Amino acid sequence: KVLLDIFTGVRLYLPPSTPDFSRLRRYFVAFDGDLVQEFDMTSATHVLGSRDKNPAAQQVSPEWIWACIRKRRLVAP
Amino acid sequence: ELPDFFQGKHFFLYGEFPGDERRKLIRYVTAFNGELEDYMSDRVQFVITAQEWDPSFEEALMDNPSLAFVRPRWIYSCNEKQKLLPHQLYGVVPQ
């Protein structure tokens, strides 16, 4: 199977200001990611960018998303 | 490195899908570079439904002649064969 279930169970808010937004989102969702809509932002498992608001989430990076898909599993932030 | 055989194709998911089928269809259409629409319009090229033909299908046809009505198994098998299969194999028509 080409589409492996990598980001299963993770709810990530991807802000449209993020560079490479469309490709990042396409690949994240393609590997079982789950995007959170803006109004539902405070309740999400990870945040891309900065811990404001919702510091209860975990901050990651587009580099993190790419490294996860290339290691074919979840990995450290 | 993902395939791109839905690129330029506009999809609308109409009606209710069983279980997580809606999420799965979103995943596959996005993966293969399909563009999913929040709303129906004459820019939609493929309506994906599990429900049966109703007069709104014909109303959308009269405003978009090239529109096609297809079952979610089209998307699933497109993923399985990793190819763009002919949607006519999985079409929805009046009953």
Coordinates of C-alpha atoms in Angstrom, one line a residue:
Chain A
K1 CA 0.0 0.0 0.0
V2 CA 1.3 3.4 -1.0
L3 CA -0.8 5.4 1.5
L4 CA 0.5 4.2 4.9
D5 CA -1.4 5.1 8.1
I6 CA 1.2 7.3 9.7
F7 CA -0.6 10.3 11.3
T8 CA -3.6 8.2 12.5
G9 CA -5.2 9.7 15.6
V10 CA -3.5 13.1 15.4
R11 CA -5.5 16.3 14.9
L12 CA -3.4 19.1 13.6
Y13 CA -4.3 22.7 13.0
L14 CA -2.5 23.8 9.8
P15 CA -2.7 27.6 9.5
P16 CA -3.1 28.9 5.9
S17 CA -0.1 31.2 6.5
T18 CA 2.2 28.2 6.6
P19 CA 4.6 28.1 3.6
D20 CA 4.0 25.1 1.3
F21 CA 0.6 24.9 2.8
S22 CA -1.3 23.0 0.0
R23 CA 1.3 20.3 -0.5
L24 CA 2.0 20.0 3.2
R25 CA -1.8 19.5 3.8
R26 CA -2.2 17.1 0.9
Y27 CA 0.5 14.8 2.1
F28 CA -0.4 15.0 5.8
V29 CA -4.1 14.1 5.0
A30 CA -2.9 11.5 2.5
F31 CA -1.1 9.7 5.3
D32 CA -4.2 9.5 7.6
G33 CA -3.7 12.9 9.2
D34 CA -6.7 14.8 10.5
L35 CA -7.0 18.6 10.1
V36 CA -8.9 20.6 12.7
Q37 CA -10.9 23.6 11.5
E38 CA -10.1 27.1 12.8
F39 CA -13.0 27.6 15.3
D40 CA -12.2 24.1 16.7
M41 CA -8.5 25.0 17.0
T42 CA -8.1 25.0 20.8
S43 CA -8.9 21.2 20.9
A44 CA -6.2 19.6 18.8
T45 CA -3.5 17.1 19.5
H46 CA -0.7 18.9 17.7
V47 CA -0.1 22.5 16.5
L48 CA 2.1 23.5 13.6
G49 CA 3.9 26.8 14.1
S50 CA 3.6 28.3 17.6
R51 CA 2.0 27.3 21.0
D52 CA -0.3 30.3 21.0
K53 CA -2.9 29.6 21.5
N54 CA -3.6 26.1 22.7
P55 CA -0.2 25.4 24.4
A56 CA -1.7 22.1 25.5
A57 CA -1.0 20.8 22.0
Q58 CA 2.4 19.8 20.9
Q59 CA 4.4 22.0 18.5
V60 CA 5.8 20.3 15.4
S61 CA 7.3 21.4 12.0
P62 CA 6.7 20.8 8.3
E63 CA 10.1 19.1 8.6
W64 CA 8.5 16.9 11.2
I65 CA 5.7 15.9 8.9
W66 CA 8.1 15.1 6.0
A67 CA 10.4 13.1 8.4
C68 CA 7.5 11.2 9.7
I69 CA 6.3 10.2 6.2
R70 CA 9.8 9.3 5.1
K71 CA 10.4 7.1 8.2
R72 CA 7.0 5.5 7.6
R73 CA 5.9 5.9 11.2
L74 CA 5.4 8.5 13.9
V75 CA 8.5 10.0 15.5
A76 CA 9.8 12.6 18.1
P77 CA 8.6 16.2 17.6
Chain B
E1 CA 5.9 10.7 -3.8
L2 CA 2.2 10.6 -4.5
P3 CA 0.3 10.0 -7.8
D4 CA -1.6 12.9 -9.4
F5 CA -4.3 11.3 -11.5
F6 CA -7.2 13.3 -9.9
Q7 CA -5.4 16.6 -10.6
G8 CA -7.7 19.3 -12.0
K9 CA -10.8 17.2 -11.1
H10 CA -13.4 18.7 -8.9
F11 CA -15.3 16.4 -6.5
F12 CA -18.4 16.9 -4.3
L13 CA -19.4 14.3 -1.7
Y14 CA -23.2 14.4 -1.6
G15 CA -25.3 12.7 1.1
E16 CA -24.4 10.5 4.0
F17 CA -21.7 7.8 3.8
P18 CA -21.4 4.8 6.1
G19 CA -19.1 4.8 9.1
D20 CA -15.9 6.5 8.1
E21 CA -16.4 6.3 4.4
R22 CA -16.6 10.1 4.1
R23 CA -13.1 10.5 5.8
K24 CA -11.7 7.8 3.6
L25 CA -13.0 9.4 0.4
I26 CA -11.6 12.8 1.5
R27 CA -8.2 11.1 2.1
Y28 CA -8.0 9.4 -1.3
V29 CA -9.3 12.3 -3.4
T30 CA -6.8 14.6 -1.6
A31 CA -4.0 12.1 -1.9
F32 CA -4.4 11.8 -5.7
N33 CA -4.6 15.6 -6.1
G34 CA -8.4 15.9 -6.5
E35 CA -10.0 19.2 -5.5
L36 CA -12.9 18.7 -3.0
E37 CA -15.7 21.3 -3.0
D38 CA -17.6 22.5 0.1
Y39 CA -20.6 23.0 -2.1
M40 CA -22.2 21.8 -5.3
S41 CA -21.8 24.1 -8.3
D42 CA -21.4 23.9 -12.1
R43 CA -17.7 23.7 -11.4
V44 CA -18.1 20.2 -9.9
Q45 CA -17.1 17.5 -12.3
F46 CA -17.8 14.3 -10.1
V47 CA -20.5 13.9 -7.6
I48 CA -19.7 11.0 -5.3
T49 CA -22.8 9.5 -3.6
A50 CA -24.0 6.3 -1.9
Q51 CA -27.6 7.5 -2.1
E52 CA -29.9 6.9 -5.0
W53 CA -30.7 9.2 -8.0
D54 CA -33.1 12.0 -7.1
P55 CA -34.4 15.0 -9.2
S56 CA -31.7 17.3 -8.0
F57 CA -29.3 15.1 -10.0
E58 CA -31.2 16.0 -13.2
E59 CA -31.3 19.6 -12.1
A60 CA -27.5 19.7 -11.7
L61 CA -27.2 18.0 -15.1
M62 CA -29.2 20.7 -16.9
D63 CA -26.8 23.2 -15.5
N64 CA -23.5 21.2 -16.0
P65 CA -23.8 18.8 -19.0
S66 CA -20.4 17.1 -18.4
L67 CA -21.2 16.2 -14.8
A68 CA -20.8 12.5 -13.7
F69 CA -22.4 10.7 -10.8
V70 CA -20.2 8.0 -9.3
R71 CA -20.1 5.6 -6.4
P72 CA -17.3 5.6 -3.7
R73 CA -16.1 2.3 -5.0
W74 CA -14.6 4.2 -7.9
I75 CA -12.3 6.1 -5.5
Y76 CA -11.5 3.0 -3.5
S77 CA -10.5 0.9 -6.6
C78 CA -8.6 3.9 -8.0
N79 CA -6.6 3.7 -4.8
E80 CA -6.3 -0.1 -5.0
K81 CA -5.0 -0.2 -8.6
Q82 CA -3.2 3.1 -8.1
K83 CA -4.6 4.3 -11.4
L84 CA -7.3 6.5 -12.8
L85 CA -10.0 3.9 -13.6
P86 CA -13.0 4.8 -15.8
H87 CA -15.7 6.2 -13.5
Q88 CA -18.3 4.7 -15.9
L89 CA -17.7 1.4 -14.2
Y90 CA -19.2 2.7 -11.0
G91 CA -21.8 5.2 -12.2
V92 CA -25.1 6.2 -10.7
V93 CA -28.1 6.5 -13.0
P94 CA -31.9 7.0 -12.5
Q95 CA -33.8 4.1 -10.9

